[PDB]
Amino acid sequence: LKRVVWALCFMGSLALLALVCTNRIQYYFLYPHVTKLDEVAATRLTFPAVTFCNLNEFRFSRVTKNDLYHAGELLALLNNRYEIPDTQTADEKQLEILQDKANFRNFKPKPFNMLEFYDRAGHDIREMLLSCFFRGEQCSPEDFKVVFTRYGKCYTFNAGQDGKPRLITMKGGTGNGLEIMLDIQQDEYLPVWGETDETSFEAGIKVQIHSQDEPPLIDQLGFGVAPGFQTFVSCQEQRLIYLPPPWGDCKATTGDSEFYDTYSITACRIDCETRYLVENCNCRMVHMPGDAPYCTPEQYKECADPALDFLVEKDNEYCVCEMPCNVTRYGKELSMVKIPSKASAKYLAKKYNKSEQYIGENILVLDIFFEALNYETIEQKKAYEVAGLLGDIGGQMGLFIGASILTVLELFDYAYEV
Amino acid sequence: LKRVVWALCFMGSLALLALVCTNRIQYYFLYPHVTKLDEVAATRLTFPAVTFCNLNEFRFSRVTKNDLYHAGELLALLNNRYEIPDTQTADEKQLEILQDKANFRNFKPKPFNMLEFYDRAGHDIREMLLSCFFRGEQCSPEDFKVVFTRYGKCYTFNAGQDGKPRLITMKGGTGNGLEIMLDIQQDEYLPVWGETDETSFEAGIKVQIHSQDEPPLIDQLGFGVAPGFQTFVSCQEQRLIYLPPPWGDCKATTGDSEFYDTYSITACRIDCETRYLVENCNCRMVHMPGDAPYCTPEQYKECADPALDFLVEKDNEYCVCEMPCNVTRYGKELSMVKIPSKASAKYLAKKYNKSEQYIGENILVLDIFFEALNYETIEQKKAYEVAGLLGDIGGQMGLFIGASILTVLELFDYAYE
Amino acid sequence: LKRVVWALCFMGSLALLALVCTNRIQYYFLYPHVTKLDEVAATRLTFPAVTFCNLNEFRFSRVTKNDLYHAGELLALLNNRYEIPDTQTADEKQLEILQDKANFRNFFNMLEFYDRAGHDIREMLLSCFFRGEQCSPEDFKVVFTRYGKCYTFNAGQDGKPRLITMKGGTGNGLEIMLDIQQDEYLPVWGETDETSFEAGIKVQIHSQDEPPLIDQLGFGVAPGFQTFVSCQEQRLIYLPPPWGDCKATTGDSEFYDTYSITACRIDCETRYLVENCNCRMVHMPGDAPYCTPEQYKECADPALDFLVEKDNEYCVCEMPCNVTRYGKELSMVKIPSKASAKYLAKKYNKSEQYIGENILVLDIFFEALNYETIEQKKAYEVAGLLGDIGGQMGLFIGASILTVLELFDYAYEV
């Protein structure tokens, strides 16, 4: 009778050991992770890269007759037939100027390049930048690097490219960061006389705060800043460390592209776009990098834009961009105050030779800074490692039957002898 | 002497095994969890539901003599004696209109319904919606579905109700989302001539971005959008998975409510409120769902409001709403640009036959989109499961005394004799 | 032949036990932690303290000839030679007033000057409502910061009970209508480091346990808008060494009962300024003597800037283990509505332009009646380590602590 109770206890114990052990094994093969959040104080923080664009792609006063000839239909100033669209709400001077520029009689077309047009017709930082201050000391327009985006000629402060050393800040708060007073030059905006999908009614700038390791993607990752306010941006540096497969989904390998030195999801996307357009249309857009020939406005109309839209719509499998394992992101909180005060409106108007109306509808102040001298860390941490797995399997294996690997080896010994 | 030192080692070892084992047991019975954060890239994202209200509950030009008679005191247009308050700082025409509507001389009232009044007097989406675009293609006012909230007649785009399929976006950025130009119709706002509790000075709209599985709750979960700016809302889809008891506190079961098909904490709140008002006052407000009769403005005055306030303070224990285990939330970052530009202001003024003053103080553009084509997941994960408990207990039990469950069974066997 | 493979199996198995066991040992000695996020619903939330400053340090109409004499250079109204700045873009009345006050023919405490000349809450506060009930200016407590005379609602200091809210949403919080008094702003006639073009207020929402640090931790609120602040209460619990880096022991400073990172920072600043210049600035607390404007010019400011740059290691402030933070999302609507502009202009005896350029409404509330908890939790405790070492020790060689003791015995005998 005792051998029966022993047999039932050993059988049930071996069954429980079986299901518990297979439980821990299956849990191990899920490759699970859990998250570790930490806050690290620092005496210094590397200041991020700040890219801003004027919402107006190019200035109206800088457009020439040749530009209307080649890129007039693309720029939406002229219709398909090289004629001005409906003149509704057209200033007499502006309409006479454009009609004169669109004469096109005995006109020998000069050679045309899209990057020349954006480079010269775009808003000049030497004209927009009314004042610059970083950590209380003056900054020059030479700190801003020219970047070409979908929005046109844009500028990146502290880009850290072309051998410039990256700036640091040793104090937090509103004073100890970037602070620029800009004139968006609303007088240079393209006149809108007829409705279009590309037609926009917005006035102001677009800013993206990003690491120097990633290129700007201002059409998607930017936020707006409106004239007439000082906008405060409190930043918090976040350092992210991810896990590669099979735990998570990250690019462990650098997987460096020909266009960009450091891998970033943004660089991977704009790389995919650049390659797709170069293969499909034998030309490259203005914002894209490399050594390919830039597209002509005819190529823009008949190939480039529908090619990108078709790439977006047809299938995402062509462009699959994994996230890198080490990522520095910047968190931000926005607030606003009114500019200028009544006590300063006249002083600004006289300092820059503008009307107080113009100052009111054209001046914006951007104040980007770190809230405090610390950074957050978000790390994916492996939840079950092989040492812990063997420890748990050994513990339960010793609890239920008290056996060891040598014991099973001895049982296989007797099985071999049989 | 060897057996004595052996006895000391066995005693200390058994004590340590005791305290360590009880430690792991108690830690297991705390039912602890820890959090797993992950970020997943996706080729498509299901666009959320977007509900917006005008901050002005109903249009002044659509209020009628009957409306003033029945709900004049409730709408704050008339005083306790059904008479207009002090005419100080009142435009002559504006007051002539109100005084004419409030004559009440030889006036035979008609039947009156609060929901009819909001549906007819509220701001019409066909008039507010100056332009609509989703993923670069035009949308109609018929795409917006009428929902009644505390703010009045409100509208939900991509509501996904009445059999409509939920919309997806295949690209991120400012262009590839919802983008509407709205006219808040500040000329239709209720006149403020005298101080009152209901008096508000704001003009603009209020928006809530929410999952299709939940009804809007704009009076608490909404953010404001001001005229004269194009407001960008960058959204980040978050997928949350919680743990039920005893680990955490979530609703494991569906918890079917009569009013709503899918359970949400918001639906639970307005369910508690609706049930409470139906039980105490036998009527439901306009925003509440169901088949109960709508309240009369007298019922609003003498029962509903004090009942809700008493529900807020006295019965704070009475309404306990548990959070669902799988929740889709949307995070948002707001930014603004100025509208209109000087190059477009006059074109807008002539296109919509308005003065530039009106465009300046009445037009706002709302741009809702996904920052990137990805979503975060925040999961509560069990920190100590029974397999790990048995493994640790077996490990320490085998380290300190080398015993097993069969060993303790044999000790009870020898004790049996 | 069987004993040889048995011996090799024991050797390799003991090697595996060695490397796995030392693996868990090293992992335990990393003292790792992981984060536990939770969301807790509540019937009540303690409402925070809200400190705000006007961006303009002091009112122009309240400055007097004595104030111009003593603090004229510091206030930037007068130059080094006690002369009015460039007369470009100078209001005729303002310039005549300043020239009269700067007559200096036949003609001071910093805190008296800030306390009396600063913006009075009794004039700025056009309306107050908390949870739908009226509040008075007496509810705001005066705190002196770098921006000057500032005010804290629900400060909870001097034994006042902290306010609670039993409902969430825009209505059920603090709601104040303020007039920033842009006419009282210092006239700006020449470029200066202190020269500012902003108009509005700066706010910091913080727990009553920490002092305000509004010049660094504040956000702006612009006139002409009602800005909503949705708050989410977060309760954070960190780990002390060797797990993380926290101050487990409160270690309260003499100035304030409860320790906070901000309080530690301003304490370090006060101590440094007292050591180098034997005086304290207006914002600093304590019983020390306040600086004279000459002391400000020749000692205080360069001492503070040098303290910031020269020795950042000198002030090391550890973070407390229990920290209550408040998250916030801002949004705006336009104020006043066209239907209300006339009523506001007439109610407060101002022009509609003045209302447009001077009135702001601040609405601070909890989005919902819940708070988040973020806990650092120990990932490997000594019980788990001993359990794992015991499990692998029993799996690989099946030994125990008694087995190693007996091996020491048998080795001792032979």
Ligand SMILES: *[C@@H]1O[C@H](CO)[C@@H](O[C@@H]2O[C@H](CO)[C@@H](O)[C@H](O)[C@H]2NC(C)=O)[C@H](O)[C@H]1NC(C)=O
């Ligand atoms: C991610 O960044 C870390 C540095 O922050 C890189 O190197 C790590 O440096 C720390 C020093 O404290 C070591 O403890 C880690 O073991 C290092 N990790 C590695 C993988 O060497 C790390 O290399 C970076 N990872 C990637 C993929 O670039």
Ligand SMILES: *[C@@H]1O[C@H](CO)[C@@H](O[C@@H]2O[C@H](CO)[C@@H](O)[C@H](O)[C@H]2NC(C)=O)[C@H](O)[C@H]1NC(C)=O
């Ligand atoms: C309403 O405002 C007017 C103008 O601001 C007040 O009249 C002046 O008030 C100032 C105080 O700021 C006095 O110094 C002037 O002497 C007043 N003079 C004139 C001619 O108005 C007026 O007192 C305010 N109050 C009322 C009830 O009208």
Ligand SMILES: *[C@@H]1O[C@H](CO)[C@@H](O)[C@H](O)[C@H]1NC(C)=O
């Ligand atoms: C101000 O700028 C305009 C720009 O055309 C110029 O014509 C004018 O001469 C300038 N005035 C002064 C005083 O510089």
Ligand SMILES: *[C@@H]1O[C@H](CO)[C@@H](O)[C@H](O)[C@H]1NC(C)=O
């Ligand atoms: C949660 O899962 C259930 C599964 O039946 C589903 O019906 C429900 O819609 C889900 N909720 C959310 C918010 O995804």
Ligand SMILES: *[C@@H]1O[C@H](CO)[C@@H](O)[C@H](O)[C@H]1NC(C)=O
């Ligand atoms: C434009 O509005 C005016 C009144 O503001 C009206 O008289 C006129 O008929 C309107 N024109 C059109 C084309 O609707």
Ligand SMILES: *[C@@H]1O[C@H](CO)[C@@H](O)[C@H](O)[C@H]1NC(C)=O
């Ligand atoms: C620290 O915070 C925890 C979490 O709310 C609380 O339980 C504990 O009492 C706090 N410690 C104190 C107040 O000393």
Ligand SMILES: [Ca+2]
């Ligand atoms: Ca500044």
Ligand SMILES: [Ca+2]
């Ligand atoms: Ca932070």
Ligand SMILES: [Ca+2]
């Ligand atoms: Ca757009």
Ligand SMILES: [Ca+2]
């Ligand atoms: Ca994100």
Ligand SMILES: [Ca+2]
């Ligand atoms: Ca309100």
Ligand SMILES: [Ca+2]
């Ligand atoms: Ca929340």
Ligand SMILES: [Cl-]
């Ligand atoms: Cl997992």
Ligand SMILES: [Cl-]
């Ligand atoms: Cl670690």
